[PDB]
Design a protein around this ligand. Structure first.
Ligand SMILES: O=C(O)C1=C[C@@H](OP(=O)(O)O)[C@@H](O)[C@H](O)C1
Length: 427
């Protein structure tokens, strides 16, 4: 078991040029692959989740080149749906975005492809998406547990009236929206009830529009899509910096700054996680917004009680920042933390208690009462990049913290610890 020990950080201050957005990167790569023409993506994220998407595109026959730092990618669009036969297996690691997006996209036309990944991926739900794709005509087989990958995709999605459950993951609707335009018939996607992680749907629609496709959004309850469309290369496209990756650094300043500025995202960003900055402000930190930066300056830190359904990933950062806040923090309406890289409610509660907090692990919320002082702990990370990054904040105190399997941050942020060290100051 590899581990890293972080020594106490007296103050943070500085500027971080953010790695590219994983959410934008994987959507842009799939759209570039489906589109006609050459797309040049810049500020693309180099991380495990993007590498799995790139490997899948390679396996599907898509041609592309990468710059030395793997952040510039020139993709030769396929000019239509991607294809492979012979039950070609695409291994997708624990990249949910790739799994869900490709599960839908590869249902176009005929195909015989198997999607699989690491053990945990075979425990992350996908039944709501499969149900919707089947209503549209797709032939999909669960090779192991019903409602979970691995899947054998044999094509057939033609369009039509498709219902989709949006209560567990927005990624199912995202995958359907990206796929439907290329189906031969028009598609009407009806959301069954609640829709969680709504801001990610806006990211999807933004990317689709960039690639030449718009649809009719009826108050997020129903989406009308015209079939027979084609995605078109936007030419050069700049991938936004990752707002979820930014959360750790902005929170670090709210706890121990100093002023930390993150570049690559700003007031105009399409990512919902820039709203994480609003939470820090509500807790007492000062935030500054620019066209291409967001910065946070230490003020004070008071506990909050908020519905965090709109920023599920960045919300984890508030759970550890809560250790430094005055009062009890409650994060609500985050049930799907349980079905992600790990069950994040169980993991977050377990590890927070190790450093001294009193924690109520609610079924779909978490209540955190910080200790008077933190104690040392060896933090388990559950093969989850965000557990490692969230707990790195424990070092903004008088106690060191040991993080197990620090390389798990490579899922979305390989250089996380060096970047945190860049803004860590001794004086
Ligand atoms: O569409 C996306 O890029 C993502 C949507 C979210 O999933 P849910 O919709 O399941 O919350 C988020 O947690 C994930 O890391 C990325």
């Amino acid at each position: 078991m590899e581990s890293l020990t972080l020594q106490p950080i007296a103050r943070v201050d500085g500027t971080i040029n953010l790695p590219g957005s994983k959410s934008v990167s994987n959507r842009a790569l799939l759209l570039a692959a489906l589109a006609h023409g050459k797309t040049v993506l810049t500020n693309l994220l180099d991380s495990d989740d993007v590498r799995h998407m790139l490997n899948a595109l390679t396996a599907l026959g898509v041609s592309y080149t990468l710059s030395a730092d793997r952040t510039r990618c020139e993709i030769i669009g396929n000019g239509g749906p991607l294809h492979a036969e012979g039950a070609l297996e695409l291994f997708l690691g624990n990249a949910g975005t790739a799994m869900r997006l490709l599960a839908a996209a590869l249902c176009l036309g005929s195909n015989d492809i198997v999607l699989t990944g690491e053990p945990r991926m075979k425990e992350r739900p996908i039944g709501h998406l499969v149900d919707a794709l089947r209503l549209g005509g797709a032939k999909i087989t669960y090779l192991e547990q019903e409602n979970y990958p691995p899947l054998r995709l044999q094509g057939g999605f033609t369009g039509g009236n498709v219902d989709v459950d949006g209560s567990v993951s927005s990624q199912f609707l995202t995958a359907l929206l990206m796929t439907a335009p290329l189906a031969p018939e028009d598609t009407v996607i009806r959301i069954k009830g609640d829709l969680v992680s709504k801001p990610y749907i806006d990211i999807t629609l933004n990317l689709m529009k960039t690639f030449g496709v718009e649809i009719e959004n009826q108050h997020y309850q129903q989406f009308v899509v015209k079939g027979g469309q084609s995605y078109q290369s936007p030419g050069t496209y700049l991938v936004e910096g990752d707002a979820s990756s930014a959360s750790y650094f902005l929170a670090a300043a709210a706890i121990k700054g100093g002023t930390v500025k993150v570049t690559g995202i700003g007031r105009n960003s399409m990512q919902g996680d820039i709203r994480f900055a609003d939470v820090l402000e509500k807790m007492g930190a000062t935030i500054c917004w620019g066209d291409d930066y967001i910065s946070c300056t230490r003020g004070e830190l008071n506990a909050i009680d908020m519905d965090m359904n709109h920023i599920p990933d960045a919300a984890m950062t508030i759970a550890t920042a809560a250790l430094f806040a005055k009062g009890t923090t409650t994060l609500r309406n985050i049930y799907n933390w349980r079905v992600k890289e790990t069950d994040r409610l169980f993991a977050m509660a377990t590890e927070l208690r190790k450093v001294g907090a009193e924690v109520e692990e609610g079924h779909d919320y978490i209540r955190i009462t910080p200790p008077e002082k933190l104690n040392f702990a060896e933090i388990a990370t559950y093969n989850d990049h965000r557990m490692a990054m969230c707990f790195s904040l424990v070092a903004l105190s008088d106690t060191p913290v040991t993080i197990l399997d620090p390389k798990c941050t490579a899922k979305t942020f390989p250089d996380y610890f060096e970047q945190l060290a860049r803004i860590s100051q001794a004086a």
